[PDB]
Amino acid sequence: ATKAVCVLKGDGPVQGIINFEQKESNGPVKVWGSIKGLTEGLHGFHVHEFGDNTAGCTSAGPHFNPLSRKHGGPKDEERHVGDLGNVTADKDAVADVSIEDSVISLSGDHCIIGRTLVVHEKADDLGKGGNEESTKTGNAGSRLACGVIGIAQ
Amino acid sequence: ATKAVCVLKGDGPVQGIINFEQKESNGPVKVWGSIKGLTEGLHGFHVHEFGDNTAGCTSAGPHFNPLSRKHGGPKDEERHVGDLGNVTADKDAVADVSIEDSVISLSGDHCIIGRTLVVHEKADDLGKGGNEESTKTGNAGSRLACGVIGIAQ
Numbered sequence: 001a002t003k004a005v006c007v008l009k010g011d012g013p014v015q016g017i018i019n020f021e022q023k024e025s026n027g028p029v030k031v032w033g034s035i036k037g038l039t040e041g042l043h044g045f046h047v048h049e050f051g052d053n054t055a056g057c058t059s060a061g062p063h064f065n066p067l068s069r070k071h072g073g074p075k076d077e078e079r080h081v082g083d084l085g086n087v088t089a090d091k092d093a094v095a096d097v098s099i100e101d102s103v104i105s106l107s108g109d110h111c112i113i114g115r116t117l118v119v120h121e122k123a124d125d126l127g128k129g130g131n132e133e134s135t136k137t138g139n140a141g142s143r144l145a146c147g148v149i150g151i152a153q
Numbered sequence: 154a155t156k157a158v159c160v161l162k163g164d165g166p167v168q169g170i171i172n173f174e175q176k177e178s179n180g181p182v183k184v185w186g187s188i189k190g191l192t193e194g195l196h197g198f199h200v201h202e203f204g205d206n207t208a209g210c211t212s213a214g215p216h217f218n219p220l221s222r223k224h225g226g227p228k229d230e231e232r233h234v235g236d237l238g239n240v241t242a243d244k245d246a247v248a249d250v251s252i253e254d255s256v257i258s259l260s261g262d263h264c265i266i267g268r269t270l271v272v273h274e275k276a277d278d279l280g281k282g283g284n285e286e287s288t289k290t291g292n293a294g295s296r297l298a299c300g301v302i303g304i305a306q
């Protein structure tokens with residue numbers, strides 16, 4: 001079994017802890033944890049290509065897209081590997097994160113260890129926004145908090 | 154070539170950027186950058202096992218030691234993979250880091266991506282300290298700053 005972890009921090013009050021667990025290299029990854037300081041509603045949730053926080057969340061680069069696909073939602077065939085959709089914050093400003101994903105991996109290939117997890121200002125439209133940017137970024141706006149995905153015990 | 158990067162952060166502020174570059178998987182890793190806010194003198198400089206900064210630098214665990222060896226200096230055959238010796242800060246509180254290492258890697262089971270880089274309070278005695286702790290930690294004291302080693306562009 002492989003485990004990874006990510007501490008989300010940024011310029012503002014958004015902070016979080018996200019855990020990843022994978023029983024087998026060919027198996028789904030469970031993603032769980034909590035993010036505080038979010039506005040009520042959907043927040044884009046992505047693995048970005050670089051584990052580079054030198055100038056904050058901007059240095060993380062584009063969505064992790066090793067297979068050169070268009071942007072989509074996690075349940076779409078047409079998606080980036082890093083497309084984990086949205087997390088949902090309630091009026092309490094807290095997102096309780098509970099995701100299972102079959103496209104990200106912690107071992108073998110398409111591995112997200114050493115890449116950056118980002119939570120966004122706005123909803124990811126999952127490529128259903130009706131403009132060009134929808135098929136690239138999902139129009140999820142600014143990067144509120146991010147962290148490098150590290151190997152866990 | 155393969156590149157990695159680490160943002161070191163801790164109280165002071167002790168703050169640094171460390172770059173890693175490897176031309177080939179069978180080649181040495183160049184490690185360079187700068188760390189500010191250090192006391193003048195030697196500071197232990199280690200890759201720790203977990204890329205887990207959930208509770209700050211303590212969650213990083215022990216020295217990265219995939220080959221089950223004792224603690225040494227980077228020039229020793231008997232060393233942990235994570236044993237990068239010391240960085241030196243001048244009176245300006247800045248350590249200019251310039252290391253070439255043949256034991257760390259950015260590929261394979263010696264790979265340091267997704268692990269934690271730590272700069273310590275005190276000198277690493279490079280296992281020549283003569284108490285027991287020398288052969289395990291090198292007696293380099295508290296963890297001043299750390300970051301997860303991420304994939305760079």
Ligand SMILES: *[Se]c1ccccc1C(=O)NCc1cccnc1
Pocket residue numbers: 106107108109110111113260261262263264
């Ligand atoms: Se997860 C991954 C994806 C693509 C290429 C390499 C890896 C990887 O895990 N590399 C480090 C490694 C390889 C073999 C054994 N132990 C660690």
Ligand SMILES: *[Se]c1ccccc1C(=O)NCc1cccnc1
Pocket residue numbers: 111113114155156259260261264265266267304
């Ligand atoms: Se080297 C390593 C260690 C832990 C987990 C994954 C890896 C790895 O090799 N990932 C693939 C990769 C791709 C581009 C640049 N660096 C690494």
Ligand SMILES: [Se]
Pocket residue numbers: 106107108111112113
């Ligand atoms: Se990995």
Ligand SMILES: [Zn+2]
Pocket residue numbers: 044046048118120140
């Ligand atoms: Zn994003």
Ligand SMILES: [Zn+2]
Pocket residue numbers: 063070071072079080082083136137
């Ligand atoms: Zn995407």
Ligand SMILES: [Zn+2]
Pocket residue numbers: 197199201271273293
């Ligand atoms: Zn250490």
Ligand SMILES: [Zn+2]
Pocket residue numbers: 216223224225232233235236289290
């Ligand atoms: Zn050691």
